Point group: C3
Chain length 163, copies 3
C-alpha cells in the first residue's frame, strides 16, 4: 500500500490490521460512524514521514513545512540555496529514527491492505469499524477474506482495497 | 499515476484505458452502478505488488502479509532478525516476474490517468462506466479529452483525475 | 504527501498551501461547492509528472500516454523493443525541467498536507474552500492547526489529511 507515518494518541501501540482514525491530531482505533483514514500496515512499499536519517528539525522549515533556503552570494554573485539549520539543533543529542520509536505507526492510506475482520465481513462487500476491527458496512471494498473469522481468535483477516 | 498490481478475473487480458472493478477478489471491466477502483495503466511511476525479483512466497509472511522474521542469538547474544523461508519454496523452479504474466495488470488508483471514453464524456465533467468504457456520470473529474470519440473507433481517450 | 505535477490555468503562480481545483484541464484556486483535487505542496516525497531529464515528447507515445516501442529483429531474430523518437524532436533545442518553469505546480493529492486556513477552521473538523483558502466544511479531516489564524496575516496554517 501507499502509507504515511502517524503518531498514536496516547503514545500507545496499535498492532497491524486495525483500522484507525484521528483525534486531536493523532491516531487511535476506529469506532462506528467515525471516519477511517487508514490501517496500520507492514506491507507498505512507499511511506512518507520517516525521518530516518536526521532529526526532523535539523533544518528550519517555513509555515508550510517546506525547507527554508538561504540565498548565498559569491564571486560577483553566483547564487545558490542552502538549508537553514535550527537554533535548537543539537549534534550532542543522538538521533533515533521513527521506525524505532513506538508512538510512530506506518498507516496505509491507499491500496490493498490486510485488515482485522469479524464474523460479519463478506467478500465484495463494504466495511465499517468498531474496536478498530472491521465489520460489514459502507466503506472500501473487501477483496478477499484470507484468514476466516473465529470466535476463539476474536478476529479474521481480509484484504480490503482502501482508497 | 500511483498504481497497484491486480489479477484479472478470468485470467483475461484487459487492455489499457478501461475502467475496472472487483469481483471475487479480481478485476474485470466496470459496468454501471458498480464501483470503479481504477484504470489499467501504462503511465504508472509508482506501482505496488510487482514481485520482480523473487517468487512472492520465497519468504513466509504472517496473517497480515508482513515478513515473519526469526530472532537469532549469537555471542552471548547479539540479536538480529532474518527472514523465514517457505517450506514450499523451490530453487529448482524458475521464476517469471509479474510484469510478464498475463493475468497481472497495472491498475492506476490515483492521479491523471488516460481513459477510454464514449460520445457522452465532456471536459470538467464526472464519469461512470459501461463495458469498462467511460460515460458521463458521477465519478472523478475529466481533465481533458485528448483523442475525441469516433463511432468508427468505438471510443475516445480522456485524461481523468482518478482519486 | 503523494503529489502530481499540474499546469495552472492562466500560467499563473499559485503559492503553496492554497487548495486547488480544475477548470478546462488546468488548476486554479478553489471556491465553494467546487471539487478540491489537492493542495500546492512543498512537502511531497513522491511526485509524478516531472520530466526532468528530457522533453516529455522526446519519445512518441500511444493514445494512452504509454511509450510506443518498435520491435527490432536481428540475427535470425533476437527481438527487443526500443523507444520511437518524435518527428518534432529537436536536439538543437535546450531543455528546461518542469521544476523550473512557473506554470507547473506540485499538487499534493494524498496525505498530510499543510493548508491555508481562516478563522472558521477547527481541529478534528472537515473543510471547504473559498479564495483557495480553507474554511469549515465537508471535506478531509483537519489534523492540527499549526499557525493560528490572524486577521493581520489574513490566514493560518493547518495540517489537513487529504485523501
Ligand atoms: N533539539 C534536538 N536536536 C537534535 N536531535 C533531537 C532534538 N530533539 C530531539 N532530537 C532527536 O529525536 C529523538 C527523540 O526526540 P523526538 O524525536 O520525540 O522529538 P521530535 O522533534 O518530536 O521528533 P518526532 O516528531 O520524530 O518525535 C532522539 O533520537 C533525538 O536524537
Ligand atoms: N513453490 C514455488 N517455489 C518457487 N517458485 C514458484 C513456486 N510456485 C510458483 N513459483 C513461481 O511463480 C511462477 C508461476 O507461478 P505463479 O507465480 O502463478 O504462483 P503464485 O504463487 O500465485 O504467484 P503470483 O501470485 O505472482 O501469480 C513461476 O515463475 C515460478 O517460478
Ligand atoms: N520540439 C521540441 N524538441 C525538444 N525540446 C522541446 C521541444 N519543444 C519544447 N521543448 C522543450 O520544452 C521547454 C519549453 O517548451 P515546453 O516545455 O513548454 O513544451 P511542452 O511540450 O508543452 O512541455 P511541458 O508540457 O513540459 O510544458 C524547453 O526546455 C525546450 O527544451
Ligand atoms: Mg514527537
Ligand atoms: Mg497467482
Ligand atoms: Mg506545456
Amino acid at each position: 500500500d501507499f502509507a504515511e507515518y502517524f503518531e498514536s494518541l496516547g503514545g500507545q501501540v496499535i498492532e497491524t490490521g486495525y483500522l484507525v482514525t484521528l483525534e486531536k491530531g493523532k491516531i487511535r482505533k476506529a469506532e462506528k460512524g467515525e471516519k477511517i483514514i487508514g490501517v496500520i500496515s507492514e506491507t507498505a512499499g512507499f511511506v512518507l514521514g520517516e525521518s530516518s536519517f536526521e532529526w526532523q528539525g535539523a533544518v528550519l522549515k517555513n509555515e508550510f513545512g517546506g525547507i527554508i533556503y538561504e540565498e548565498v552570494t559569491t564571486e560577483d554573485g553566483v547564487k545558490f540555496k542552502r538549508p537553514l539549520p535550527n537554533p535548537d539543533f543539537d549534534p550532542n543529542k543522538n538521533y533515533i529514527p521513527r521506525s524505532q520509536r513506538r508512538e510512530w505507526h506506518v498507516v496505509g492510506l491507499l491500496g490493498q491492505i490486510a485488515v482485522r475482520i469479524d464474523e460479519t465481513v463478506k467478500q465484495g462487500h463494504s466495511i465499517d469499524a468498531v474496536g478498530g476491527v472491521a465489520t460489514d458496512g459502507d466503506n472500501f471494498i473487501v477483496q478477499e477474506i484470507t484468514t476466516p473469522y473465529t470466535k476463539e481468535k476474536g478476529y479474521g483477516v481480509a484484504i480490503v482495497l482502501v482508497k
